[PDB]
C-alpha cells in the first residue's frame, strides 16, 4: 500500500499531488454522505506535517466557502512537499491556520477532522499530540479520521499510548490491518474505503483481505436439484465425554444446518444418547469407554467409522487428559481423511503429527489454545497474523484463530473475518463452528474455502439474532444459520 | 471562466492537472448519479486533442476496471500537454485507444461520453467530426457531454453546423451561456454544474447568472402583519382599445395576484366594463375616446390618475396607430413615476423619451418588438444579450427581452431566466407579466429586482399547470401564480 502509492506515482505516473487531491475530496464526500449537507457545520481540521496532514489541508481548502467555518490547527514541525504544497493552497484560498492548540477551541466547532498521523505514525504519541487526542476524545464532537485514526498502528491495530476515537474513518485504496484488528477496528467507527485512482491491478495484488459477502456468495457450494444426501457428503464428529455431553450436538448440528448430507457423532455411552433426544435427525454412535473418555481402546472402532465418511471433526468436549492424548495423536496420525481439529483435540495435540499427515487439516483454536499449542503467551498470539501464517505454512494446514476478528490462513492466503458480535463470546459457539467447517469440506469445498465461508456465516447468524446479543446462545445460533445463508444469496 | 481556470492555476497555484483530474472524476460521479451503478455498462469515450479530450481521458481511465468495457476513439491531430499527460496515463493503466471511427462501433457500447470539443470550439464542425456527431445522434445510445456538447458555441448557444444532442451535460465551475441560450440549452440535456476546485471568490465574480429559486426567495418583499393595501402599493395600467378589451384584465390581475394593494385600469369606454365583469376586484376607469383609442385628448386625465399611484404600466392592447403614438410619447415624457412599458407602448415609442426621463423604466419586449424598437432584424436581436446590455445601459432602463430564456438586464447586471414552458407561447402571457412586474415595483422592489422575480414566478406558474402545457391559457396562468409563490417559500 505504501508500495502502492509509490508504484502508482513512480511506475504508472500519477502525480502524487493528484493522489493527495483525490484523497481529500473523497473525505469531504464521505462526510457529506454521513452528515448530510455540510454547510451548517463548523470544521476544525487537525493537521500534522506528513502527507496525512496534507490530505487534511485538501479537506480544509475544499470546505472553504461552503461551510459555516473552517479552522486548521497545524501541529507538525516540518512539512513534506505535498503537505507544503497543500498548506500553501489553503492559505492562498483564504484559509485560517493556527499552530497553538487552545483546549477551548473545541467549543466553537462541530466536526473535528483528524489529520495528524496516518500510516506514517512511528512509535508512541506523547506530549502535545497526546493532550490533543485526549482533548478531542473528551469533547463529544463528531470526529472524522483521515486514513487511520491518529495513534492506531496501521499494521497491527495497536493503540500507541493513545488514539483518536473516530465516528468515521475514510481510508484510501484498501483497508489497512489496523482497521481490521482490535483495538484499531474499534476506534475506526464507520469505515469507508475510497478509490483515489490506484490502478485496479495493484489494488487487487493485495496478499490479505477481509472476507466479503460477495466472496462467500461465490464460494457456496451448488445445490443441484438431482441430488441426494450422498452428494452433500458425510461427516463424523468424534467428541464428547462424561464432562461434556452437549458439545457434540452443537457440532453435529452445525454440520447439518450448513447442508451436509449425513452427520454421525461418536460419543461415549450414555452421553451419546443426549444428542438424539434433542435433535433425532443426528445419528449418535455409542462408544464404550472405561472412564467416560476416549482412549486407545477406541482407536480401531473410530478408524472403522472413519472409513465411510468424507471428513472427520475431532475435539469438542473430549476432555484434556492422557487417555484422550494417546487417542487423538494415534488417530490423527493414521486417519487418511481431511480433519477438523478443535478444542481439546488441540490441547493434547503433538504437532509432528500434522507434519507427518498426508491428508489435510484445519485447526480452529481460540487464543488460549493457540498459546498452549505453540508454547507462547496469550498476549503474544492474539491477533498475530504472522504467527498464524508461519504456523499454517509450516505444518501444511489451515489455521482459524478465533477472535472478534478471526484470522483464517493457509500460509499464503490470509483472510480476516469481521462478522459477529459478543453473543458468540459464550461457550458453545466454537463447537458450532467446527461442525460448519467440517460440513463445508464434506460438500467439496477446500479447507481454506470451507473455513472462510464458515466464519462468515457463523458471525452473520449471530448478527441476525432478534433480541439482545448478550442473550444469544449456541442453540439459537444453530437456528439462525439457515437464515444467514438465505440472506447471503 | 477561461480567465478563471487561468487565475486558479497562475495566481492561486492549483496545478492544471489537478483541475483536469477533478473534472473527469466529476463526470464519472455525475453519470453514476444519473445511471445508477456503472459496472453494467460499456463506455465509448470520444476524445479530441484539447483539454476537453483530456477531461475525456480522465473519465476513461477512471472507468478502467470498474465497468464492463471502455474504448477511447481519439480524433485530434495533436494533444495539448494536459491531454497528453492524460492519454499517457490511460494507456499505462491498460486502456484501449483507436484513432479510426467505424460507424458500427456504436453497436458494442451503451454510453457515449462526448469529449471532442468544449469551450475551445472555434467555427464550424465539418468533415470527420461532422459525420461522427451525426452518427452518435442517430444511435439512440445514452450520451454524456463533457462541459459543453461538442458543437455548441459556449458563448452564444449556437450550433456550429452540427452538435451533439446530450442526455446529460456536466460542466465545470459555472454554467456557460451556451447551456442557457437556445439551441444549446436544448442539446445539453440534464445539466450538472460540478465544483472542480476553483476558489469560491472567482466563481462568484461572474457578471452574469441564471435566476435561481434562492435568489427569488430572498428578493420577495416582506409581508408585515400590520399592513393594509397601501403598504403593498398602487398600480395604474393604461391599456386596451376597441380591438383589445382583454389585455388589461390580464395585466391588472397579474398585478393583484403578486400582492399589490390596489390596481386601477384605465381603458376606453365601454371596453373598461369587461374587466370588472370577470374580476370585479379590479377597478377599471372608463376613458372617453373619439375612435376607441387613446389619444392626446386623454393625456391630462391619465396624468391625474397617475398622481396617486406608485408605478404605471402602459401598452398592452393600446393599438399601434398615430393617436396612440402621440399619446404614449407625451405621457412617458411627462410621467414622473416608474414606468413599465410593453407591447404597443413599445411599438410607437420614441427612445429619446427614455433618455430624457428622470424616472425609471422597465421595457418588456419580445424579439419582434425589440427588432422594431432598434431597427434590426428579429434574427439579429434574438438571444442577443450584448445588444440588450448596450440598450439598457444607454437608455438608463431595464430590458426584459422575453424568450424561452428571457434576458433581464440593466446594463451592468445581466440575469437569464430559464423557468417556463411552451404554454406561455400564446397570446396574453406577456400581458400577465407586465402586471406582475409593475406589481412588484409597487411593493418596493427595484425595477431589476421586480423584473427578476416576475419572470421567474411567471415561468414557474406555467410549469405548475396540471394538464398539457399546450392547453394552458393566460387565465389559468393567473390562478397558478399564487401557487408558484407558495411553492417558492
Amino acid at each position: 500500500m505504501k508500495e502502492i502509492d509509490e508504484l502508482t506515482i513512480k511506475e504508472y505516473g500519477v502525480d502524487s499531488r493528484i493522489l493527495m487531491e483525490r484523497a481529500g475530496i473523497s473525505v469531504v464526500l464521505a462526510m457529506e454522505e454521513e452528515l448530510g449537507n455540510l454547510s451548517d457545520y463548523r470544521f476544525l481540521v487537525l493537521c500534522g506535517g506528513g502527507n496525512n496532514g496534507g490530505d487534511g489541508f485538501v479537506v480544509a481548502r475544499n470546505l472553504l466557502g461552503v461551510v459555516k467555518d473552517v479552522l486548521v490547527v497545524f501541529l507538525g514541525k516540518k512539512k513534506t512537499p505535498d503537505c507544503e504544497y497543500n498548506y500553501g493552497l489553503y492559505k492562498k484560498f483564504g484559509g485560517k491556520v493556527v499552530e497553538q492548540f487552545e483546549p477551548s477551541i473545541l467549543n466553537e466547532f462541530d466536526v473535528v477532522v483528524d489529520a495528524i498521523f496516518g500510516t506514517g505514525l512511528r512509535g508512541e504519541i506523547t506530549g502535545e499530540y497526546a493532550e490533543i487526542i485526549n482533548l478531542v476524545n473528551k469533547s463529544g464532537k463528531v470526529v472524522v479520521s483521515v486514513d487511520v485514526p491518529s495513534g492506531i498502528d496501521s499494521n497491527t491495530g495497536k493503540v500507541l499510548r493513545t488514539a483518536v476515537k473516530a465516528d468515521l474513518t475514510v481510508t484510501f485504496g484498501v483497508p489497512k490491518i489496523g482497521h481490521i484488528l482490535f483495538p484499531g477496528r474499534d476506534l475506526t467507527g464507520k469505515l469507508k474505503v475510497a478509490n483515489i485512482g490506484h490502478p485496479v491491478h495493484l489494488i487487487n495484488s493485495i496478499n490479505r483481505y477481509v472476507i466479503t459477502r460477495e466472496m462467500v456468495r461465490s464460494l457456496l457450494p451448488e445445490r443441484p436439484r438431482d441430488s441426494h444426501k450422498g452428494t452433500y457428503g458425510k461427516v463424523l464428529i468424534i467428541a464428547g465425554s462424561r464432562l461434556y455431553s452437549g458439545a457434540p450436538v452443537l457440532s453435529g448440528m452445525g454440520s447439518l444446518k450448513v447442508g451436509t448430507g449425513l452427520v454421525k457423532l461418536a460419543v461415549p455411552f450414555p452421553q451419546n444418547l443426549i444428542a438424539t433426544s434433542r435433535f433425532p435427525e443426528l445419528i449418535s454412535v455409542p462408544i464404550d469407554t472405561e472412564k467416560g473418555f476416549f482412549s486407545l481402546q477406541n482407536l480401531q472402532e473410530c478408524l472403522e467409522l472413519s472409513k465411510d465418511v468424507d471428513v472427520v471433526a475431532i475435539g469438542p468436549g473430549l476432555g484434556n487428559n492422557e487417555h484422550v492424548r494417546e487417542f487423538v495423536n494415534e488417530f490423527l496420525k493414521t486417519l487418511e481423511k481431511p480433519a477438523v481439529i478443535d478444542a481439546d483435540a488441540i490441547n493434547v495435540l503433538d504437532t509432528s503429527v500434522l507434519k507427518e499427515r498426508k491428508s489435510p487439516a484445519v485447526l480452529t483454536p481460540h487464543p488460549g489454545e493457540m498459546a498452549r499449542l505453540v508454547k507462547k503467551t496469550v498476549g503474544d498470539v492474539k491477533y498475530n497474523y504472522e504467527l498464524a501464517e508461519e504456523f499454517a505454512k509450516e505444518n501444511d494446514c489451515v489455521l482459524v484463530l478465533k477472535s472478534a476478528t478471526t484470522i483464517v490462513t493457509d500460509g499464503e492466503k490470509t483472510l480476516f473475518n469481521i462478522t459477529g458480535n459478543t453473543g458468540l463470546s459464550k461457550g458453545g459457539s466454537g463447537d458450532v463452528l467446527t461442525g460448519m467447517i467440517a460440513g463445508f469440506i464434506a460438500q467439496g469445498l477446500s479447507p481454506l474455502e470451507a473455513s472462510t465461508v464458515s466464519v462468515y456465516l457463523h458471525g452473520f447468524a449471530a448478527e441476525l439474532f432478534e433480541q439482545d446479543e448478550r442473550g444469544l446462545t449456541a442453540s439459537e445460533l444453530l437456528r439462525l444459520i439457515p437464515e444467514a445463508i438465505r440472506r447471503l444469496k | 471562466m477561461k480567465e478563471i481556470d487561468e487565475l486558479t492555476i497562475k495566481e492561486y497555484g492549483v496545478d492544471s492537472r489537478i483541475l483536469m483530474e477533478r473534472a473527469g472524476i466529476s463526470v464519472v460521479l455525475a453519470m453514476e448519479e444519473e445511471l445508477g451503478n456503472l459496472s453494467d455498462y460499456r463506455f465509448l469515450v470520444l476524445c479530441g486533442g484539447g483539454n476537453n479530450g483530456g477531461d475525456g481521458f480522465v473519465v476513461a481511465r477512471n472507468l478502467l476496471g470498474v465497468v464492463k468495457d471502455v474504448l477511447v476513439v481519439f480524433l485530434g491531430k495533436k494533444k495539448t500537454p494536459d491531454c497528453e499527460y492524460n492519454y499517457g496515463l490511460y494507456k499505462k493503466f491498460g486502456g484501449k485507444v483507436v484513432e479510426q471511427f467505424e460507424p458500427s462501433i456504436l453497436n458494442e457500447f451503451d454510453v457515449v461520453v462526448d469529449a471532442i470539443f468544449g469551450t475551445g470550439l472555434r467555427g464550424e464542425i465539418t468533415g470527420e467530426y461532422a459525420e461522427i456527431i451525426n452518427l452518435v445522434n442517430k444511435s439512440g445510445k445514452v450520451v454524456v457531454s463533457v462541459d459543453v456538447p461538442s458543437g455548441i458555441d459556449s458563448n452564444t448557444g449556437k450550433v456550429l453546423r452540427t452538435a451533439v444532442k446530450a442526455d446529460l451535460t456536466v460542466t465545470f465551475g459555472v454554467p456557460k451561456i451556451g447551456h442557457i441560450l437556445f439551441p444549446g440549452r436544448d442539446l445539453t440535456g440534464k445539466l450538472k454544474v460540478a465544483n472542480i476546485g476553483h476558489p469560491v471568490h472567482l466563481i462568484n465574480s461572474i457578471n452574469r447568472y441564471v435566476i435561481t429559486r434562492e435568489m427569488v426567495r430572498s428578493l420577495l418583499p416582506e409581508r408585515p402583519r400590520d399592513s393594509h393595501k397601501g403598504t403593498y402599493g398602487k398600480v395604474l395600467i393604461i391599456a386596451g382599445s376597441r380591438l383589445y378589451s382583454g389585455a388589461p384584465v390580464l395585466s391588472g390581475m397579474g398585478s393583484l395576484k403578486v400582492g399589490t394593494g390596489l390596481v386601477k385600469l384605465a381603458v376606453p369606454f365601454p371596453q373598461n366594463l369587461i374587466a370588472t365583469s370577470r374580476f370585479p376586484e379590479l377597478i377599471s376607469v372608463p376613458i372617453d375616446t373619439e375612435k376607441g383609442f387613446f389619444s392626446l385628448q386623454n393625456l391630462q386625465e391619465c396624468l391625474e390618475l397617475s398622481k396617486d399611484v406608485d408605478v404605471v404600466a402602459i401598452g398592452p392592447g393600446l393599438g399601434n396607430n398615430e393617436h396612440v403614438r402621440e399619446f404614449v410619447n407625451e405621457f412617458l415624457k411627462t410621467l414622473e413615476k416608474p414606468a413599465v412599458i410593453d407591447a404597443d407602448a413599445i411599438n410607437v415609442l420614441d427612445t429619446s423619451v427614455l433618455k430624457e426621463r428622470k424616472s425609471p423604466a422597465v421595457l418588456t419586449p419580445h424579439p419582434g418588438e425589440m427588432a422594431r424598437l432598434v431597427k434590426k432584424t428579429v434574427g439579429d436581436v434574438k438571444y442577443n444579450y450584448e445588444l440588450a446590455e448596450e440598450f439598457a445601459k444607454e437608455n438608463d432602463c431595464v430590458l426584459v427581452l422575453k424568450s424561452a430564456t428571457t434576458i433581464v438586464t440593466d446594463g451592468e447586471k445581466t440575469l437569464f431566466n430559464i423557468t417556463g414552458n411552451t404554454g406561455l407561447s400564446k397570446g396574453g402571457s406577456g400581458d400577465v407579466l407586465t402586471g406582475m412586474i409593475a406589481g412588484f415595483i409597487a411593493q418596493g422592489l427595484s425595477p431589476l429586482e421586480a423584473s427578476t422575480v416576475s419572470v421567474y414566478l411567471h415561468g414557474f406558474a406555467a410549469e405548475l399547470f396540471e394538464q398539457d402545457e399546450r392547453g394552458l391559457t393566460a387565465s389559468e396562468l393567473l390562478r397558478l401564480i399564487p401557487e408558484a409563490i407558495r411553492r417558492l417559500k
Binding site: 473523497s26 464507520k190 469507508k192 474505503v193 | 460521479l29 470498474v66
Partner: peptide
C-alpha cells in the same frame, strides 16, 4: 459503488 466501498 465507484468512489466508496463499505
Amino acid at each position: 459503488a465507484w468512489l466508496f466501498e463499505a
